[PDB]
Amino acid sequence: SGTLSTFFRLFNRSFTQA
């Protein structure tokens, strides 16, 4: 479920870099 964890990991990582 959850998910949300992963989605938040890719969203934060992508926002930080790029």
What can you see in these coordinates?
It is classed as signaling protein. The entry lists the keywords helix, signaling protein. It forms a monomeric assembly. This protein is mainly alpha-helical and 18 residues long. The chain contains one helix and no strands. It has one helix at residues 4-17. It is rod-shaped and about 25 Å long. 0% of the residues are buried.
Percent of residues in beta strands?
Answer: under 5%
Principal-axes geometry comes out as rod-shaped
Main beta sheet: none
Q: Tell me the number of helical segments per DSSP (H or I, 4 or more residues long).
A: 1
Query: Radius of gyration in whole Å, from Cα?
Result: 8 Å
Structural class: mainly alpha
Element string (H = helix, E = strand): H
Separation of the first and last Cα atoms: 26 Å
Number of strands: 0
- Share of helical residues: over 70%
Question: What's the topology here?
Answer:
Layout: H1 4-17
Q: Keywords for this structure?
A:
1 helix; signaling peptide TCP3; helix; 18 residues; signaling protein; mainly alpha; monomeric
Brief account:
With about 20 residues, the chain is mainly alpha-helical. The chain is built from one helix and no strands.
